[PDB]
Amino acid sequence: NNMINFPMYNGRLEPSLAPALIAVAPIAKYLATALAKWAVKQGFAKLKSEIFPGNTPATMDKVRIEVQTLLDQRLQDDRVKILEGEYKGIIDVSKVFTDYVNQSKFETGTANRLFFDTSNQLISRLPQFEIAGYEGVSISLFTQMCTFHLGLLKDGILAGSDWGFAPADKDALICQFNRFVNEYNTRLMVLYSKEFGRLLAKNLNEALNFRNMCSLYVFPFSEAWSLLRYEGTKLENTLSLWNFVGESINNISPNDWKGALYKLLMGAPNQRLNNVKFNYSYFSDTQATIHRENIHGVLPTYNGGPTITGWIGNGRFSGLSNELEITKIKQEITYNDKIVPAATRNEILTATVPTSADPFFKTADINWKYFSPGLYSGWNIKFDDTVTLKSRVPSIIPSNILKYDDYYIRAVSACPKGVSLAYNHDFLTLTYNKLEYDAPTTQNIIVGFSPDNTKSFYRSNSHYLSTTDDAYVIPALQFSTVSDRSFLEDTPDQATDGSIKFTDTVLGNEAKYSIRLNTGFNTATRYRLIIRFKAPARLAAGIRVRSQNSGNNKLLGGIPVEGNSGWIDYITDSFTFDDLGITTSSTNAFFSIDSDGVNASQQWYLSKLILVKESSFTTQIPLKPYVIVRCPDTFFV
Amino acid sequence: NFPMYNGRLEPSLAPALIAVAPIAKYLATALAKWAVKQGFAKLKSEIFPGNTPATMDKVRIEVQTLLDQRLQDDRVKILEGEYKGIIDVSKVFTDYVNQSKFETGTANRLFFDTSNQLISRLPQFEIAGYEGVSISLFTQMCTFHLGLLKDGILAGSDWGFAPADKDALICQFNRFVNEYNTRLMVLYSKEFGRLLAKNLNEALNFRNMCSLYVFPFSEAWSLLRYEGTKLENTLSLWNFVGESINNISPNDWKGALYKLLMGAPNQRLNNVKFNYSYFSDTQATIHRENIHGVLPTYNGGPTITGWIGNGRFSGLSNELEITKIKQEITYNDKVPAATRNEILTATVPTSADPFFKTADINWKYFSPGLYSGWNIKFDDTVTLKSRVPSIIPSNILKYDDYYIRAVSACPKGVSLAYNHDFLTLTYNKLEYDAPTTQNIIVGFSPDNTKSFYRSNSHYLSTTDDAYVIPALQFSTVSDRSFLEDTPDQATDGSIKFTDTVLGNEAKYSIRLNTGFNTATRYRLIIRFKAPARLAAGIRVRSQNSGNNKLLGGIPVEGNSGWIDYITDSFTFDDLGITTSSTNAFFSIDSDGVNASQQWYLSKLILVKESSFTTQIPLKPYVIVRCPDTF
């Protein structure tokens, strides 16, 4: 890698495939239309023509090679043969079923029989796509197969007696859909946890590369599964992608990732970057043979609070007034003729985001290069077309472009080097405590790319609603204010940059979300709010959803919380923005979520709010059967 | 050498025994329930007992002993003449209207003789060059006149006032209740500002005198128009120990120093740290100790505290936190021989009464200047016994019926004019970096504040007719909020709200003591100052476990004075608040404000509907406006 003189793209010799042109993008685009309006008895067939176009495994082959290329991991030749057999089997049985139900006349009893052939084919074959020791590659294949099965079950339930389903048989399908949509999520996160955890210990750069793959090929579909029981929601992905430059880092635990590092990468989650600072040192010897540059710290400053950001690493000058803040010190030293430094430079470098209608960095050219045997080693730092640092190493350091089409640079951070990440987890919060981590150095820079769909919030700090939108998603991290003793929780299966964990035991727990109405908004249209939250223990006073507008506060819903280990979707009663007194000129309007103080066992999570029009939204698959009193067992009959 | 009491050889008079104490006690009674046509006469018996200036003489000598200031012999004789004139004319009036039968027209003329006597003699107590002593005497003569005016208004035709004459007295009351406040603050500001430039310890000693002899009565003026409120003083007393500080400006006091003294204004002290240095030369003749920093840590947020001064070790791993370092150095006879740098910690005991009561803190410079050291002791726990060979005398810091709420210092060697905009109640670290302090400041809060600072909650008793919530005794507060020194409110200060975008709010936690009658009708008095108009006004709410009620929407048209807003009646049943409620709040919120709209919150007063009345209105009854001149 050090002998090769190639322009590089995120540490690779070739530019990566744009996120919008990946093999699974047409499947995600179809699911977005299906989740907004489900085509009854056609939903599964149209999904099948995207997963298995022309009754071929061609798309699942294109997914495998794209993923193998990105991970630089490969399945065994014989395992590929096996998966070909399993695809052929699923295609054979599913073509028979869809050929039958697309005749103008068919027998409902036969359609019922061929449906279950397809369903039990997927139940028995699925474990072939949970491939032990190759979870990184197989998680993207397993994702699509679970998606295929869940789309089949949904279409069968809405089909009813048209495909020979009696009321009691329609109830048995609802019982399986509700069971599988949780079990598949569990079995998905089993694969992700193993591989992410294994790579956190091996190489942080490789771990971020795997999480980036899952952000595009996996987590958009787990979110689609959680929305599949509905019609008239919006499929949205706000996961960020992370690129790593610098010396290797390893031996990170998942607890290290969740407790510290991920909070350190996210900085102020509800704000765009303002400027990032680098603690730079340069060193040259008397003989002009040694030229070494080091980055000892990164200090990202975001557009506002309530999060407080400090040094990751340190901002100290070593090797040289404490109450004075030194930004730069040069030193030239001459010695008696008969490794000692001749020139040293210590500087705080600043990269400032431009103030314009588009206050974001798009691309970056950051690289670190070690020239054997170790005399030269230096850094280039460049955002967009602005050079922050050109290496004072005499030889030229190759370009290392960081970019993703339809993404922009939201965060710049680093991983502390030379210290354990197991400390201060309880005091790395969204407010009050300084989000920092002291280390002797970093010798790495991490860049966070957020998708262009988030540009409107991070530019304005408000959620602008258009009357032409059937649905809008408010991710929990895009808040205006949040209560103390609140944490950022990594919940990637939600296809967001995370959830808010509330832990305050005394005063109470609340997050506010600024909303605006775009001009021409119809304040008479009836809306609903979906609140997704996990609360594993009973709250006596439950969780309150409110609108606040310039002293006019409405209670939109009191959520009864009896305690559940899973994610819950509370749907409010219908309302209009006329009910709330909000207009296209309101400027202090918020949605708010609040609970009382919570003990250790009562600490709960807020994922997102979904605003839907009443006229287009329906629960198509219920949490409980209609007729039968209990779901059957998976036990003996 | 001799033991000292707050830097003096003789102990100071206990706060409960000062000459104005009986006057304050009567005003507390009369503010709960006014005696119609007797209020002025009973107040006269407290200010001029037995028709003598004996109490006003006692006040003068007490305050003179406290400030080490004295009126000239000639000015003393003049005041005796003034007191005689006021007493004689006040006694004639009170004797005549206490007869079985009197003529209303004659009572009317004797009233104006008394009222116009005070108006023409009052400026004799705004003594130029002696405002320090004269402020306490001016305070009582203003109290005397406002008492007479209120009784004139309630007597009406009984003392010969036609409805139009009654309105003119209401016009005079409303003018003078503000004008006397302004003329008081002019005296206070001149003397406080003069002493800040001279000597900070001497300046805090003046504010302490005003917190007992002056500011309780300015608060009493603001409650005199009502009946059924509570008169309360929550001002802290401040004691200074260390090297002299001078050339402080009043702007530095409000903008920085006072905020540093108050620390977390809604919390009790948990621990305080001291940055200590000890130096001893080769000859064992020089022993010097210095205090370079004070770091007070309070019970909780939302305030974040930092070093006042610094926590650095001078004269010696920037990643590791060193708490102590000793050095013994031997040179070649042919400079330091022993040095100690240490972070000392005084920790408040964790008990049913988690407060220091007293302190013994002293700094002594032994001329020629070889010895100089510190003693630091809270209660019976010694934090530092000076390593100077000679014993440093005792310096007892205590106030009967007060306890230690805050420990802080004044930054030495730096200008106090910086970062005023970023010294906030929240978000920003409440610190001020300086090379040293060489002083320690102790804040004593009165025992009436113990309940709140112990529990972080306002417990309400069913047997009490009124309860005062000082603004600084909050649970949570919005960002871009400031502590505002407002000693005329008889509290340790107000909240200033300056957030431009998100909003300004403050919550106060309330609990109900067992046996609380939840069916009793109550009202809330909200004292605020909003100089400019607010389109969405100021909202007052109750919050309880999700149940949130609006208690009042205040219209803010804009006014430069302190405005009291009185909410509509309500029961705790209406709010769903019980004796088992633990999440009950009173809340005050407004929208974002620009620079002109920035407003202040002084206090909330909870009053029973049955015993509360506005006896003196803010506008006349019959005449449309207060009389113009030309």
Numbering used by the authors:
A (entry chain A): 12 to 331, 336 to 353, 360 to 658
B (entry chain B): 16 to 331, 336 to 353, 361 to 656
Manuscript text:
These are produced during sporulation and are remarkably stable in a variety of conditions, but dissolve after ingestion under the high alkaline pH levels characteristic of the larval mosquito midgut. Solubilized protoxins are activated by insect gut proteases enabling binding to gut cell membranes, subsequent oligomerization, and ultimately gut cell lysis leading to larval death.
All residues are visible except for the N-terminus (residues M1-I11), two loops (residues S332-C335, and G354-S359) and the C-terminal extension (residues S659-K724). The lack of order in this extension is not surprising given the low complexity of its sequence. We note that the buried surface area (BSA) at the tetramerization interface is 33% lower in Cry11Ba, pointing to higher flexibility; this hypothesis is supported by the absence of interpretable electron density for residues at the N-terminus (332–335) and C-terminus (354–359) of the βpin in the Cry11Ba structure. Cry11Ba crystals assemble from tetrameric building blocks analogous to those in Cry11Aa crystals, as judged by the similarity of their crystal packing patterns. The BSA which associates monomers into a dimer (interface #1) is 38% lower than the homologous interface in Cry11Aa (1009 Å2 Fig. 2e; vs. 1631 Å2), explaining PISA’s failure to identify the tetramer. Moreover, the emphasis on lattice-forming associations (rather than associations within a tetramer unit) could explain the larger crystal size achieved by Cry11Ba.
